[PDB]
Design a protein around this nucleic acid. Sequence first.
DNA 1: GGTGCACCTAGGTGCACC
DNA 2: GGTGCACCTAGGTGCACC
Length: 132
Amino acid sequence: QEPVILIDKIERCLVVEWYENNIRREQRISYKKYGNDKAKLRAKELIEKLKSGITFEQLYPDKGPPIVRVFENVGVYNVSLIRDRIEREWRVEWLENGVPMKARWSCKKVGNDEAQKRADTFAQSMIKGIFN
DNA sequence: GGTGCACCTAGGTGCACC
DNA sequence: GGTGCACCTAGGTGCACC
């Protein structure tokens, strides 16, 4: 169930295959392009990142569903953090007095990193109990 | 036949420009 | 302040050399 390096001599590429929950996911590294030494090193780098706890989506957000829910229904307020590729924005959803509410930050303005930082700071500070 | 450098392309991304 | 559209990187492959 740990991440593993596979060889595809027909495609002339490595394949780093690992399992999250019960789903398998692979990432190809062509040694036709990168070469044997570089490919093995970059695959090691990805192995290191997966050892750190990084998930699939934060590595390849381009791949997967358009709307991704980082977490949802967090106890009270049912706080949720969402990444939306269609509208290219970071959103937070919660329930204040049984009322659905949401905020959004664009990525076109500040970028993926700052938009995630502001949405995360907003959401976790909401869980701390200091926002209206 | 195997290998990897050198190009090429499509699509995400975020800055500049008002 | 919001967009358009100039960049950038990843992914794919031909092509002289082992």
